[PDB]
Amino acid sequence: ALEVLEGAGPGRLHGRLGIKPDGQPGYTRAPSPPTDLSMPQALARGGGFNLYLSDHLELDRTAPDARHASCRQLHYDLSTLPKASVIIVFYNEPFSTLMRSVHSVLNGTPPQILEELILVDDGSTLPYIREDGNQQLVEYLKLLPAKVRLIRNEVRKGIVGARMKGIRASRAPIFAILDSHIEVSPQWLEPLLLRIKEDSRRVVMPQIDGIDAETFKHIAGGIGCKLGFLWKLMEHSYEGHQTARLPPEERQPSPTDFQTSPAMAGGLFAANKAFFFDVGAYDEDFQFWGTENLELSFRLWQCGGVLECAPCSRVYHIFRKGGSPGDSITINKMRTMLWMDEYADLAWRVIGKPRVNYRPESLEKRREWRKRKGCKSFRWFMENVFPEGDVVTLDDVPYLGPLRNDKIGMCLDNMGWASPGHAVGLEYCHGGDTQTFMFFRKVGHVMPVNDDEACLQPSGRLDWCRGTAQFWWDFTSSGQLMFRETKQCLSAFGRKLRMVECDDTDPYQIWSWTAYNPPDTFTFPSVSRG
Amino acid sequence: LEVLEGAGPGRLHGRLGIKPDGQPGYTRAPSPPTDLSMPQALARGGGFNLYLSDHLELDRTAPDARHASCRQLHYDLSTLPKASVIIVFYNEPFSTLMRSVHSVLNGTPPQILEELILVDDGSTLPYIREDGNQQLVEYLKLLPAKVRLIRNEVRKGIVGARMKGIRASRAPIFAILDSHIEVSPQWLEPLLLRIKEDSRRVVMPQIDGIDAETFKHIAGGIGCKLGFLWKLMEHSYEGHQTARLPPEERQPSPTDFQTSPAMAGGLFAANKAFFFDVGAYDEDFQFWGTENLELSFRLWQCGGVLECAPCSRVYHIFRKGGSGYSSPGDSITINKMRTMLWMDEYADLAWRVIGKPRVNYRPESLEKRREWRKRKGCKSFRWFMENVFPEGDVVTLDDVPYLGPLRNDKIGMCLDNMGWASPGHAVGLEYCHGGDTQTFMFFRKVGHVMPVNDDEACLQPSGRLDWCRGTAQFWWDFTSSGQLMFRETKQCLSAFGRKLRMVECDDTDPYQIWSWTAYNPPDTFTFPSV
Ligand SMILES: O=c1ccn([C@@H]2O[C@H](COP(=O)(O)OP(=O)(O)O)[C@@H](O)[C@H]2O)c(=O)[nH]1
Ligand SMILES: O=c1ccn([C@@H]2O[C@H](COP(=O)(O)OP(=O)(O)O)[C@@H](O)[C@H]2O)c(=O)[nH]1
Ligand SMILES: [Mn+2]
Ligand SMILES: [Mn+2]
Ligand SMILES: [Mn+2]
Ligand SMILES: [Mn+2]
């Protein structure tokens, strides 16, 4: 309700925030948490973080500068940089974390480059937010710059629907999407604006540091810039063996270099608004949460965009511990498979061949849009954007199906635990997903189809896949599973899994494995009719 | 001996249990003694009259409990998939077990019966033991080769016993039956046809009765749809719950397959592959109890459908005044805790109803089960209540607005179930102490006032608990002034004179003002520590 900045200075570029006319803070900080606080409870009561502590900490909390020293040697001309609209969507975000995020942005963003701060209430039900509530939020916003504007979805629409509401309400040539439980490092916005100014086709995302949900300590982010994806359709940081496949000039980049990434971690990024809509914005038939980051990543790269990571733009993020819709996660994965072309056959089988209502009629309009825009193929994506992946073409998956030993008339069985850490069994073949395995030849990995993170080991037991010799298997021309490092072979003798000297005359070590020969085109599965 | 001599209607597998010399392989007992004390014989027979069971024939003819229209259906046994029938037993007497086997063989066409797997779950009876008198093994030699016996060296329980049989089955479909049953004609054909069309269906026959005392065949009086109680036990749809169904489903034809939120016991058929893909059983369940609800919840949430076939009927001996075996006391509680994993926030209500137990529910294994639920992409329990069981009295926890003491401030006392909590006894007024005996809950959808430990017991204006019914005889309103008003008579409950009597409603009389703690459970149920 007031656009003035009284008290502006370093660490508080928008002036003293949230001060009442009488010079008192517009909210009552909480006392120190009780000494007998039961943490697993508070987390379950606080929606994934310790709210007793969050309420006690100041909204103007000072954070360590997580940037590399060389990031501070950079110069920005705030007069020539374009303005940006910061968007924070939230559903029932507690007052302390939400307002600390707002305070962090205003305190650490020069007013010259910040057009506005848009808060999107995605149908919250907490009394402190509701239109028919106690009005705490609305009352407190009057104590912040007029830049801050609140808009609401009368019904919770989800991440996509909520972000679209905010993006549409923005003015700046650039918008920046942030979480509702964050704290920024210094000069977080300047690098993003300069990068997008030079080329509006770039979608740039800050690097994400951590705030401990239990202690709220500031933690350095350990994630590199480059993110791949798993065939379960979730982003996955480049592993050691994947980083080694990069061009030698990109394996150890400077801490100030902007680095491309095939995929986006979450939803913290900046983009030119015009280009964002021309490249398809979001798929608004996505439901609530899940996979929209990968769908955007695939579409962006294929349809003329660039996804980059800015190590000099850092934002802290509270990762939940204590925790806190129907069919939404599976639907979003099916819709994302549109952009995977023939590779969708592999992803479809990995997530269990679901038969859901993915809104086919709407997905077909999205297919028409993809055609008109002239987007490139997923094969192009794998070969040019993510060529470091273990599966660049489907020929990299030569086998997919049961691993059957004819001698004992049984098949390998993950025993209902596709998670790493458990023993693999021998059971009578029934053709279900629990008994199908696939082979990634680039790494010699034997994995259950429902989890490309679990790998068979000579111990006869599953463990987390690593691109090393500890998980490298060869499937001989005679049907043997040979562990390359020890040059031994896996046997089913006595309905037990043991490693034995290789000998193709021993029928107990001869396995059959269905060849994987998927079609040139993935035909989506038919859909049927509170 | 896969040959069958004497095959005809009533004995589709031939004359069973005939010795080489043409005599039956077992001697029927004489008529029960005339001076038989029935309450004793039931206790000494494991829940049924064994004197009579031993006297009855193994080929006992049963009445056709099917609706007349069920016989007008035709099945093509050549196009139906085969099934493996599994019967697990722990110390089941010879007469009831073999009558079950005879009933299945006599009444199942050999073209659709792959095999009959008998699972000895560590029985100790001499007639079963490997080191016993060999009665069972010797008598099995007089039955078709389809019938094969397998054993658990140590008693594993219902889940462990069934999984052994399921894993050992060969047919694409398995059907589990109890060891004390008799089937109606064409019991298996409807299940095979239904699962053939859609392998995601788990179909269960309707269960008729065999009187434990007289062995009379009795028509089951329970409809097809089964809900559940917050004590975590299946419960047949009630009258007022059926009325909430769509009008086209309140009285369906006797040939229609009907969905059911919950499974009665363990009598069902399923595609073996799909059964394993949907998590099979939770093999950390102990001994007896609740696996049917865990399977029911998991089945619906993870892409399955539970249906009941009224044209598929099986008689079942329900025990009376006795049990065929004992189990630890905490084993049932453990199974209930593990079932609460699939109930999400609703587990808070279930936890309180069964008395906030603190048991060793094997958390490390249950947390792996949680990861499986995430990878599989199973839907939430709220989805289940709103989509699978929307006819329940508690669809959201908002349907339970009050849970806690019912206290009258005037006399400084609370309602007290007086150590009963079972229906049929008077409710008392006692000094408040905060224990389970003094906490009550309110189901607003039917106006029920119940002790927290029994959602089947309802307060009545008589000052006494009785079996809950969805009628005006149990409807209470909790006014804005704190009154318990019986809607039918428009009177209010008073504590005047430390007695519970109905009086004219008047918010100025302090003897009729009650306080009732509001129920506001968390968004997430945190399991108790072990
Ligand atoms: O239905 C929803 C779910 C989430 N969000 C908001 O979207 C942002 C991203 O969600 P989340 O915080 O879960 O992301 P993550 O914690 O995985 O970084 C947060 O501000 C949420 O409050 C929302 O507006 N609607
Ligand atoms: O530890 C056990 C308990 C039960 N059962 C068998 O499992 C079936 C189901 O048990 P029961 O009939 O007692 O269940 P109820 O119908 O009484 O709920 C019966 O054939 C039991 O003999 C078993 O094999 N092991
Ligand atoms: Mn977040
Ligand atoms: Mn990895
Ligand atoms: Mn039984
Ligand atoms: Mn009832």
Numbering used by the authors:
A (entry chain B): 98 to 421, 426 to 630, 635
B (entry chain A): 99 to 628
Text taken from the publication that reported this structure:
O-glycosylation of the protein CST1 by the mucin-type O-glycosyltransferase T. gondii (Txg) GalNAc-T3 influences cyst wall rigidity and stability. The structures reveal a unique GalNAc binding pocket that dictates the substrate preference of TxgGalNAc-T3, which is coupled to a 2nd metal binding site that is strictly conserved among apicomplexan homologs.
We then verified the substrate preference of TxgGalNAc-T3 for endogenous T. gondii cyst wall proteins using peptides and glycopeptides from CST1 and SRS13. Surprisingly, there is diminished activity for the C-terminal mono-glycopeptide SRS13.3, while activity for the SRS13.4 di-glycopeptide is ~1.5-fold lower than the SRS13.2 mono-glycopeptide despite the availability of two potential acceptor sites, suggesting that either the C-terminal acceptor site or proximal amino acids are inhibiting enzymatic activity. To investigate the basis of the substrate specificity and function of TxgGalNAc-T3, we solved the x-ray co-crystal structures of TxgGalNAc-T3 in complex with Mn2+, a non-hydrolysable form of UDP-GalNAc (UDP-2-(acetylamino)−4-F-D-galactosamine disodium salt, UDP-GalNAc-F) and each of the following glycopeptides: CST1.4, Muc5AC-3,13, Muc5AC-3, Muc5AC-13, and SRS13.2 from 2.2-2.9 Å resolution.
